Design a protein around this ligand. Structure first.
Ligand SMILES: CCCCCCCC/C=C\CCCCCCCC(=O)OC[C@H](COP(=O)(O)OC[C@H](N)C(=O)O)OC(=O)CCCCCCC/C=C\CCCCCCCC
Ligand SMILES: CCCCCCCC/C=C\CCCCCCCC(=O)OC[C@H](COP(=O)(O)OC[C@H](N)C(=O)O)OC(=O)CCCCCCC/C=C\CCCCCCCC
Ligand SMILES: CCCCCCCC/C=C\CCCCCCCC(=O)OC[C@H](COP(=O)(O)OCC[N+](C)(C)C)OC(=O)CC
Ligand SMILES: CCCCCCCC/C=C\CCCCCCCC(=O)OC[C@H](COP(=O)(O)OCC[N+](C)(C)C)OC(=O)CC
Ligand SMILES: CCCCCCCC/C=C\CCCCCCCC(=O)OC[C@H](COP(=O)(O)OCC[N+](C)(C)C)OC(=O)CC
Ligand SMILES: CCCCCCCC/C=C\CCCCCCCC(=O)OC[C@H](COP(=O)(O)OCC[N+](C)(C)C)OC(=O)CC
Ligand SMILES: CCCCCCCC/C=C\CCCCCCCC(=O)OC[C@H](COP(=O)(O)OCC[N+](C)(C)C)OC(=O)CC
Ligand SMILES: CCCCCCCC/C=C\CCCCCCCC(=O)OC[C@H](COP(=O)(O)OCC[N+](C)(C)C)OC(=O)CC
Ligand SMILES: CCCCCCCC/C=C\CCCCCCCC(=O)OC[C@H](COP(=O)(O)OCC[N+](C)(C)C)OC(=O)CC
Ligand SMILES: CCCCCCCC/C=C\CCCCCCCC(=O)OC[C@H](COP(=O)(O)OCC[N+](C)(C)C)OC(=O)CC
Ligand SMILES: CCCCCCCC/C=C\CCCCCCCC(=O)OC[C@H](COP(=O)(O)OCC[N+](C)(C)C)OC(=O)CC
Ligand SMILES: CCCCCCCC/C=C\CCCCCCCC(=O)OC[C@H](COP(=O)(O)OCC[N+](C)(C)C)OC(=O)CC
Ligand SMILES: CCCCCCCC/C=C\CCCCCCCC(=O)OC[C@H](COP(=O)(O)OCC[N+](C)(C)C)OC(=O)CC
Ligand SMILES: CCCCCCCC/C=C\CCCCCCCC(=O)OC[C@H](COP(=O)(O)OCC[N+](C)(C)C)OC(=O)CC
Ligand SMILES: CCCCCCCC/C=C\CCCCCCCC(=O)OC[C@H](COP(=O)(O)OCC[N+](C)(C)C)OC(=O)CC
Lengths: 187, 187
């Protein structure tokens, strides 16, 4: 705690020194910023005037392109309205024919699909009956060759625990005194 | 280990029974699948025939409108050129005016970018001459603080280590000794 008290004492001394030193440079820097600020406002009017001139030219062009925009808009509009009228009848026709085809397709496969799913249903059911027999037998044997393990694993773990306790207990006691023996040095 | 051996002993026995049983079901499932697939091969043709019908229809329809779109596209190809010719002239008019604007814009900043460099250097030179003297004091006083920083840092650590080793070395002994005992029981 010696260094802590000394460091806090030496600091304030140079603290004021560096403060005044930085303050001096700060003051000088402000002068530089002040002159620079003035220059910024000096060229401002010149940049403003030039900008106004630019705007005038751009607005003039906006007015010139206004009528042309309307004309080109009409020319483009007149193109689609002519084409759409010649493409609609063809599309309208084929759409109905396609739609009707899908419906007929579904109706055609309906009876075929119905019989297939019906025949397969019985097939799967017959197979299930046989499988269930063998399945049941396997289930009963599965549990028989399962419970036997844990039944002898649990008691063995308890016995093991009882044999480690004595050694651990004595070790814990030494750990306590050892731990606190370190705290004294740290603190 | 005997517990797990008992599990492995009757393992393959049960597996062999179930595996052979499942193999028997395989042949049954195979026969069922073959008899099902045989019928599915009859349903397919009826779908293909229907699909192939509409396919040819669409093929002919598509061919019918083939040159029809060409007539429309041809007009679009020409109308395209028309709109371009009526818009280009105006763009060119402003294009020349744009380049003329750049000429003035460049010459308007050219001299400033030079004087800006002059003022910048003058400011830096003056600042350097001023701060150059304080930079030395900043370092001089900083080093003095550094000496009072890393002085009693190392010596204190050496003393701390000496008052720990004789206690830690003895702790490892008890730890390692107990380890061997636990291993014996666990193994
Ligand atoms: C250089 C880069 C540009 C400037 C960066 C710093 C800008 C200012 C900000 C912090 C400065 C450092 C501040 C360090 C802690 C200072 C703590 C202190 O002394 O407080 C008392 C006074 C006043 O402080 P405040 O201005 O914070 O006012 C506090 C008051 N309660 C309120 O908020 O109303 O102090 C003062 O008036 C002047 C103190 C001068 C200390 C020495 C001077 C400290 C100034 C700069 C260096 C600080 C670190 C020095 C060591 C490392 C570098 C060598
Ligand atoms: C049970 C399912 C989950 C655990 C599965 C563990 C599978 C084995 C994995 C590691 C054990 C071996 C770990 C390495 C042991 C040291 C190496 C050894 O001696 O291997 C002996 C032989 C031959 O070699 P490996 O099989 O080990 O393979 C090559 C070997 N590792 C090498 O280095 O080349 O393999 C064997 O004897 C089989 C040993 C295991 C028998 C089954 C051991 C099974 C586990 C426990 C049984 C004993 C305890 C029973 C009571 C408690 C039950 C929870
Ligand atoms: C580089 C290796 C250094 C090894 C030694 C330790 C570091 C020494 C270096 C600098 C030390 C600076 C002082 C550190 C604390 C010294 C003891 C001390 O003052 O205790 C007391 C100090 C009181 O601080 P405050 O007056 O701000 O109180 C704030 C409110 N609470 C927190 C007190 C409730 O505690 C602190 O300042 C920390 C919050
Ligand atoms: C020059 C070498 C020796 C060290 C010199 C000082 C180095 C810088 C010290 C601290 C960093 C901040 C410096 C600038 C602010 C100083 C004042 C300050 O608020 O410090 C931070 C704090 C202030 O505590 P106060 O109770 O005064 O509250 C002030 C208002 N605020 C900050 C709470 C909003 O105190 C500390 O954090 C402990 C150090
Ligand atoms: C060639 C590279 C360098 C180019 C430098 C160009 C010139 C730069 C000079 C100054 C920077 C711009 C200054 C004008 C915008 C300031 C924006 C800003 O954040 O103001 C922040 C703050 C605003 O303060 P107030 O809202 O109270 O009113 C303005 C300041 N006065 C008039 C009250 C003092 O400033 C101050 O308080 C005083 C410093
Ligand atoms: C590396 C450079 C990056 C920046 C490039 C573009 C620099 C600016 C472009 C050209 C420089 C000259 C610009 C001239 C017009 C400036 C317009 C401007 O900002 O007014 C800024 C400000 C605007 O408010 P006023 O109070 O003026 O008027 C009312 C508000 N309205 C209507 C103007 C939105 O007015 C001032 O601050 C007074 C000086
Ligand atoms: C790959 C695309 C190539 C396109 C090239 C440029 C094509 C230019 C064609 C048209 C330009 C846009 C015209 C937008 C208005 C169309 C108005 C119109 O269609 O009147 C004809 C009819 C009814 O139109 P309405 O005015 O009653 O309703 C739509 C328009 N309003 C009302 C919302 C403004 O609609 C049709 O016959 C289309 C099924
Ligand atoms: C070998 C390939 C196996 C994978 C592809 C199988 C393709 C279809 C052929 C055979 C599969 C088995 C068909 C027979 C058993 C069907 C079992 C089943 O869950 O029926 C499910 C369901 C049963 O009928 P519903 O849910 O309609 O009930 C009656 C109607 N209401 C009361 C619900 C309104 O029918 C369907 O969901 C049709 C999809
Ligand atoms: C390699 C030979 C051993 C193979 C064992 C695995 C294969 C077993 C063969 C067929 C059956 C597999 C599915 C059933 C396995 C479990 C059978 C059994 O009764 O376990 C025992 C028990 C059964 O419980 P429940 O079926 O009455 O259900 C109760 C509610 N919860 C838990 C289902 C939400 O469950 C447990 O004790 C917890 C694990
Ligand atoms: C390598 C270990 C593999 C462990 C799983 C395969 C071997 C064990 C399988 C089956 C064991 C069958 C014989 C079990 C004899 C001991 C039975 C026993 O003590 O039950 C003890 C206890 C009984 O609890 P409850 O009957 O009130 O059931 C409550 C609902 N739950 C928790 C069962 C979902 O349940 C447990 O302690 C474990 C959750
Ligand atoms: C690697 C060099 C040798 C390190 C040997 C370490 C021997 C002890 C092992 C772990 C403890 C490390 C403590 C590190 C911080 C020491 C200073 C410290 O924080 O004291 C205090 C710290 C926390 O516990 P405290 O009791 O102080 O605070 C909470 C309880 N009360 C106070 C609210 C009632 O103590 C520890 O965290 C454990 C000692
Ligand atoms: C939007 C769906 C309309 C459905 C009803 C109409 C279906 C028939 C209409 C078009 C089908 C494709 C016709 C293909 C033969 C005519 C192609 C043709 O125009 O050659 C004339 C001309 C040039 O054809 P190119 O083959 O040289 O194309 C340019 C080169 N690259 C890009 C092909 C490498 O066409 C054009 O310049 C573009 C309009
Ligand atoms: C309202 C009408 C405008 C909107 C609807 C347009 C419908 C037609 C759309 C695309 C196809 C027709 C595009 C316009 C007619 C093009 C006629 C033509 O020159 O074919 C051939 C032409 C060959 O082009 P090159 O690759 O040899 O390059 C020539 C030089 N430049 C242009 C690259 C500088 O193809 C093209 O230039 C690509 C467009
Ligand atoms: C509301 C308005 C909506 C849009 C309306 C658009 C109306 C016009 C339609 C499409 C716009 C693009 C038309 C492009 C036609 C291109 C015709 C063409 O290049 O012939 C070829 C001719 C020479 O091509 P070169 O490759 O030798 O030179 C130009 C390209 N390089 C060389 C500079 C890379 O083109 C020129 O000489 C241009 C100076
Ligand atoms: C944050 C404001 C308060 C603190 C301001 C501290 C200003 C710098 C401190 C002292 C002025 C610079 C002294 C440079 C020589 C002493 C060592 C040193 O500083 O190394 C840091 C730095 C570079 O030093 P050198 O380029 O000499 O490199 C090492 C020497 N050899 C290998 C190049 C031969 O210093 C500077 O860049 C000068 C600004």
């Amino acid at each position: 705690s010696t260094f802590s008290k000394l460091r806090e004492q030496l600091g304030p001394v140079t603290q004021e020194f560096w403060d005044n030193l930085e303050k001096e440079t700060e003051g000088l820097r402000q002068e530089m910023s002040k002159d620079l600020e003035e220059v910024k406002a000096k060229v401002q009017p010149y940049l403003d005037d030039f900008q106004k001139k630019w705007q005038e030219e751009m607005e003039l062009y906006r007015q010139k392109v206004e009528p042309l925009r309307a004309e080109l808009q009409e020319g483009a509009r007149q193109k689609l309205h002519e084409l759409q009228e010649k493409l609609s009848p063809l599309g309208e026709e084929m759409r109905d024919r396609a739609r009707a085809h899908v419906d007929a397709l579904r109706t055609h496969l309906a009876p075929y699909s119905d019989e297939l799913r019906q025949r397969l249903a019985a097939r799967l059911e017959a197979l299930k009956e046989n499988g269930g027999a063998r399945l049941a037998e396997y289930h009963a044997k599965a549990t028989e060759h399962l419970s036997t393990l844990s039944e002898k694993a649990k008691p063995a773990l308890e016995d093991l625990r009882q044999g480690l306790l004595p050694v651990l207990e004595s070790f814990k006691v030494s750990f306590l005194s050892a731990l606190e023996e370190y705290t004294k040095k740290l603190n």
